[PDB]
Amino acid sequence: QDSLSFGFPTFPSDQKNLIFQGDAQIKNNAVQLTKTDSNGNPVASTVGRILFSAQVHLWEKSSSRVANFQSQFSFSLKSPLSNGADGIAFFIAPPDTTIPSGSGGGLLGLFAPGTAQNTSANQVIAVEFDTFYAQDSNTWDPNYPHIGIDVNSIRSVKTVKWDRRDGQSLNVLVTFNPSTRNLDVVATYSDGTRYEVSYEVDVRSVLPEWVRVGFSAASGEQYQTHTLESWSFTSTLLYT
Amino acid sequence: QDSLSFGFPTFPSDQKNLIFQGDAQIKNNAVQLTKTDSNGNPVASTVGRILFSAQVHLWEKSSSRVANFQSQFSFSLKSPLSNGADGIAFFIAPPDTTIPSGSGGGLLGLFAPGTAQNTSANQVIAVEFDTFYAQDSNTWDPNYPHIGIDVNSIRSVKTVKWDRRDGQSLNVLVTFNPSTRNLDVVATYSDGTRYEVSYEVDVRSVLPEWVRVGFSAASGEQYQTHTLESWSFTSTLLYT
Ligand SMILES: CC(=O)N[C@H]1[C@H](O[C@H]2[C@@H](O)[C@H](O)[C@@H](CO)O[C@@H]2O)O[C@H](CO)[C@@H](O)[C@@H]1O
Ligand SMILES: CC(=O)N[C@H]1[C@H](O[C@H]2[C@@H](O)[C@H](O)[C@@H](CO)O[C@@H]2O)O[C@H](CO)[C@@H](O)[C@@H]1O
Ligand SMILES: [Ca+2]
Ligand SMILES: [Ca+2]
Ligand SMILES: [Mn+2]
Ligand SMILES: [Mn+2]
C-alpha cells in the first residue's frame, strides 16, 4: 504494498533497481539521461530514460483508494549552445513502457510521432521542463521555455513560463493529492526563484492501477546534457 | 537507493513486487507460505518463500556505510496436530537466492542438508520461529519451541524459549542498529506476553552489499499453516 518509498541522494555506479533505456547511464554519481562524448560534452540525436524497477500501486479499484504521492528531484542542464534542447520529464506510465520509435527531439522520449497529440492513443502523465520551442518542429509548444503538465499528449494541458540556466541545479517537488485531485509542481533555483504550475486530474481515468515512475530526456538537432542529480519518491494509498 | 521502505498492511491477490518460490501463494488477503488443500487445511511435505523484488542496499564498501533496518510483521500458525511443524523465518540473503534442494522440514526452506551446519557454505541471516524440536531429527535444536537467530547455519547462534499458540497472531519487530551492530528481536502476543532476543553481528562479514529480504516456511512429516498477515520494512544507509 500500500506504501512505497525510496531515496537516491546521489547515484553511485552500482545500481540494482533501475531500468535503463536508450542512452541513459551513470557517470560521476549522477544519471546522464542523454549521450555525452568521450570529453563529456552533449551530442545530437540521443534519447534516454530510467524507471525504478518496483511497480507503484497508484490506485486500487476493489477499495476505491487512490495514492497520494510526492516526487522530489534535482537536475541540471549544460550546453555549449545558447539554445540547448530538448528537455527532461518526470513521468508515470504503465509498467511495460519502452522508448517509442522516433520519439527523440521535442517528443522527449515519451511519444511516437504519429500519435503524439492523440490523447486516446497514449497512457502517460508527465511533468516536462522544455527548453526548445521553435514553431517549425515543436508546433504544439508556447513560444518560450516552459514547465508543462502533459496528460496523454505532448501538447501540455497547462504550462508556466520558465527560465533555463546553464549549469544550475533546479530543485523540483511534484505532489499529487487524491482528496483534491491536484497535481502540483513547484520548482526552485538556489537563489529562491520559484515556478509553480498545477492541474486537476483524475489519475484513475488515465493510468492503470499499477505503474512505473521515472525520467526521460532527449536531444534532436540541438543538444545539452540532462543530468539527474538526486531523486526521492513516496506513495501511499488513501481513502478520501 | 540509500533508503527504501514498503508496507503491506494486508496482502490482496493482485501482487506485482513479490517473488513467490515453492508453494507460497496469496489466499484470503494473507500469504500462505506452505501448501493447504481445498479446505484450507495444512498438508505435509511443502516449502514456500516470498521475497520483495527490489534489492536492498545493506552496506556500501566505497563509503563505509551500513544500513539501519527495521522489519515489522505478524503471522499465525494453525494445525489440528499436537506437534505442528516446522516453522517460519524472516531472512536476508543474496538476491539470487532460491529454495535449496532438500531444504524442507526442519531446514525451513533455507538450508541444504549437506551444508546446513557449515557456516562457510552459506550466506543467510534469519530469525526463526521454530515449533518442531524432536531430538531425533532436529538434532541441532534445544528441546522446546523457540525463537532463534540463525547466521549461516540452522543451528542458531542463540535461542530463547517461545510458546506456540494455535491460531493466534504474533507481532514481531526485528531491528538492526549498525552503530552497536545489535540485531534485536521483540515478539508479542495480543495479551501482552513478550519475547526478546538480541545478538551482535557485523552484517558486512556475512552478507553481500545488496540483498533481498523475505520469509520462508516448511513442513516435513508434521505440518501446520504458516500465514504471513502483514509486513512493513524500512532500511536506510548510515555513516558508521
Ligand atoms: C536529428 C533528430 O534527432 N531529430 C529528431 C527530431 O528533432 C527535431 C525537433 O523535434 C527538435 O526539437 C529539434 C531540436 O533538437 O531538432 C529537430 O528539429 O524530432 C523528431 C520527432 O518530432 C524525431 O523523430 C527525430 O529523431
Ligand atoms: C517428508 C519430508 O518432507 N521430509 C523432510 C524432512 O523432514 C523431517 C524433519 O526435518 C522435520 O522436522 C519433521 C517434522 O516435519 O519431519 C521429518 O522428520 O526434513 C528433510 C531435511 O532434514 C527434508 O529433506 C525432507 O524433505
Ligand atoms: Ca519543446
Ligand atoms: Ca526445528
Ligand atoms: Mn512543451
Ligand atoms: Mn531451531
Q: Domain with A20 in it: what CATH number?
A: 2.60.120.200
Give residues 46 to 105 of B whose Cβ lies within 8 Å of A: 52-55, 57, 60, 62, 95
Residue B230: CB atoms within 10 A of its CB come to 18
Method of structure determination: X-ray
Q: Which three cell numbers stand for residue A218?
A: 532527449
Is the CB of residue B212 less than 8 Å away from at least one CB of chain A?
no
User: Is A231 within 8 Å of A71 (Cβ atoms)?
Assistant: yes
User: Which of the listed residues B221, B223, B224, B226 should we mutate to test ligand 2's pocket, taking the one with most ligand atoms within 8 A of CB?
Assistant: B221
The shares of helix, strand and coil residues in chain A, as percent rounded to the nearest 5, are 5, 45, 50
Instruction: Quote the DSSP letter at residue A42.
Output: B
Instruction: Determine whether the shortest distance from the Cβ of B104 to ligand 2 is under 6 A.
Output: yes
Supply A89's cell numbers: 520529464
Give every CB contact of residue A139 below 8 A, 6+ residues apart in sequence. none
Q: Of the candidates A229, A238, A208, which has an alpha carbon nearest to the alpha carbon of residue A30?
A: A229
For residue B215, give the nearest of B141, B128, B152 by alpha carbon: B128
Other Cβ atoms less than 10 A from the Cβ of A148: the count is 25
Q: What span, in angstroms and rounded, lies between the C-alpha atoms of B121 and B77?
A: 30
**Whole-angstrom distance, CA of residue B61 vs CA of residue B203:** 12
Closest Cα to residue B92, out of B235, B192, B239, B237?
B235
The domain in which residue A116 lies consists of 1-240
Resolution attained, angstroms = 1.8
Hey, which bits of B112-193 come out as E strands?
Answer: 125-130, 146-151, 158-161, 170-177, 182-188
Nearest CA residue ID for atom 24, ligand 1: A102
B132 is in an annotated binding site: yes
Q: Report helix, strand or coil for A52.
A: strand
- The alpha carbon dihedral of B162, B166, B168, B174 has a sign of positive
CA distance B53 to B74: 20
Distance between CA atoms of residues A9 and A55, nearest Å? 21
CA distance B146 to chain A (A): 30
Contact B106, B220 (CB under 8 A): yes
Q: What is the number of domains present in chain A? A: 1
Cα A20 to Cα A32, A94, A98, A215, B196: the distances in Å are 11, 16, 10, 10, 44
- Check CB contact under 8 Å for B54 and A210: no
User: Would you state the cell numbers that stand for residue A97, as one nine-digit string?
Assistant: 513502457
Q: Are A85 and A222 in contact (CB under 8 A)?
A: yes
Q: C-alpha cell of A219?
A: 536531444
Torsion of the alpha carbons at B211, B212, B214 and B220, rounded to the nearest 10? -80
Q: What is the phi/psi pair of residue B129, to 5°? A: -120, 100
Q: B-chain residues within 8 Å CB-CB of A6?
A: 3-5, 54
User: Ligand 1 site: residues with CB under 6 angstroms?
Assistant: A 44-45, 85-86, 102, 104-107, 113, 132, 137-138, 219-222
| Residue A14 in contact with partner chain B when CB distance is under 8 A | yes
C-alpha B176/C-alpha B201 separation (Å) is: 9
Per the CB < 8 A criterion, the answer to whether B229 and B32 are in contact is no
